[PDB]
Design a protein around this ligand. Structure first.
Ligand SMILES: NC(=O)c1ccc[n+]([C@@H]2O[C@H](COP(=O)([O-])OP(=O)(O)OC[C@H]3O[C@@H](n4cnc5c(N)ncnc54)[C@H](O)[C@@H]3O)[C@@H](O)[C@H]2O)c1
Length: 420
């Protein structure tokens, strides 16, 4: 408290004061902890990687995936624990980072001198980290001061945690103490420069810890947001807009998106009938722009990335195929001719349970899209339908293993993208 009030914003290299500051708040914090919270924080110290990987499994799973009960409690308890340790004022924190957490596949090390960052590489890196909110999965533990030792990693992240961030002081090494940050945040870069540490150059990413609107498994908040923001939208629909949205949603999407993609027409119908429907849906989707940045999701089929169900390249159980996919698509901009059916929940969908490509889309304020599930007849649905003719900017690709039978017992790819 006295030292909470008198501490700097950035401990920089003062790890003495940092550990002192850390020490009291550490003691006081755990005396607010239930037995379950202490043991869950202890579980995080012992195997953070397993807990964090599980948080990913769980949030992307099917609805009645019951998973592993211990890790469920761990996920719940770590979160309440750190929420009892909120920052009184901003805190800068530090960690070395791998380029794939920025979706960057180019080597930053110059080929001439390993102590020196490559100029063209870091210029490409500057572009890649711009205009992107980098979602951070699981809990993120960090350090209070600029590292004083080598890393095999190319990047140093200098991250600004805002006031009231759940950020608990913890660890075993009681000099060099760590900071445990709650789930649910993203990274937004605020600057880039080269920093020399122990004779070696690293790419220093200055960034802010920000919180994006991302419902993940929270159906109640999702439903409430949809209702609040798109109930008036549903009112303003012309009878033909309502009809053709409902037609699309009830199965018309198959012929409509097929036509938009490459002009295929069934012998049953006509160009004019398809165009009219596309006209009505698209005019509808322009009537109330997305009111705030939101994260939304899509179970994508292989065709959306030029693959077939039986393409060798679609076997992500092989590391080489994940690498190929990352090399092909990271940093790319992909035109999307179709309307985009998305769901604001991270939950898997039964009809699409085995699709291996999971879009995690940053949908900006101002996008021509609507929460169409406000309409009558879409209970259990949480869809945001996006207008045709936008593009995906591919920001990251993150593999995880869906171990479930219904999910397909396969590696899947979380494809972080920005709608442009
Ligand atoms: N995650 C989702 O897929 C999702 C989300 C919300 C709602 N829905 C609901 O499910 C139904 C829509 O199913 P869907 O998502 O399979 O429909 P879709 O028309 O998007 O996809 C049908 C097939 O076409 C392919 N495809 C789609 N867009 C493509 C493109 N731009 N390039 C190449 N291929 C493309 C897909 O991979 C898929 O195999 C609707 O009833 C909708 O309300 C689905």
């Amino acid at each position: 408290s006295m030292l909470d009030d008198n501490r700097p914003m950035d401990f920089a290299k003062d790890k003495n004061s940092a550990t002192l500051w850390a020490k009291k708040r550490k003691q006081v914090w755990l005396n607010n902890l239930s037995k379950a919270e202490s043991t869950s924080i202890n579980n995080y110290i012992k195997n953070s990687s397993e807990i964090n990987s599980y948080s990913i499994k769980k949030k992307f799973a099917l609805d009645n995936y019951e998973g592993i009960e211990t890790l469920n409690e761990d996920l719940k308890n770590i979160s309440t624990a750190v929420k009892k340790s909120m920052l009184t004022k901003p805190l800068y924190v530090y960690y070395y980072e791998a380029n794939d957490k920025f979706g960057f596949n180019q080597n930053l090390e110059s080929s001439l001198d390993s102590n020196i960052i490559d100029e063209e590489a870091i210029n490409n890196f500057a572009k890649k980290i711009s205009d992107t909110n980098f979602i951070q999965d699981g809990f993120k533990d960090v350090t209070m001061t600029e590292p004083d030792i080598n890393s095999k990693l190319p990047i140093l992240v200098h991250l600004k945690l805002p006031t009231n961030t759940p950020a608990a002081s913890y660890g075993n090494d009681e000099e060099n103490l760590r900071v445990l940050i709650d789930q649910g945040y993203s990274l937004k870069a605020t600057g880039l420069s080269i920093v020399t540490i122990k004779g070696k150059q690293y790419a220093k990413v200055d960034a802010d810890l920000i919180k994006q609107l991302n419902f993940e498994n929270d159906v109640i908040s999702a439903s409430q947001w949809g209702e609040e923001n798109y109930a008036p939208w549903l009112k303003e629909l012309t009878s033909n807009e309502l009809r053709d949205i409902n037609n699309y949603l009830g199965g018309g999407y198959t012929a409509i998106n097929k036509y938009l993609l490459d002009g295929t027409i069934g012998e049953n119908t006509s160009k004019e009938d398809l165009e009219e429907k596309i006209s009505n849906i698209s005019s509808a989707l322009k009537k109330r722009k997305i009111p705030e940045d939101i994260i939304t999701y899509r179970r994508m089929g292989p065709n959306e990335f030029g693959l077939d169900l039986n393409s060798p390249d679609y076997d992500f159980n092989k590391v080489e195929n994940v690498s190929k996919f990352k090399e092909k698509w990271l940093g790319k901009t992909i035109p999307v001719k179709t309307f985009i059916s998305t769901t604001v929940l991270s939950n898997n969908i039964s009809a699409f349970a085995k699709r291996k490509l999971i879009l995690r889309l940053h949908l900006p304020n101002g996008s021509n899209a609507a929460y169409v599930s406000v309409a009558e007849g879409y209970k259990n649905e949480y869809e945001v339908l996006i207008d045709h003719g936008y593009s995906y900017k591919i920001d990251n690709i993150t593999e995880y293993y869906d171990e479930s039978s219904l999910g397909g017992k396969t590696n899947k790819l979380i494809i972080d993208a920005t709608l442009i």
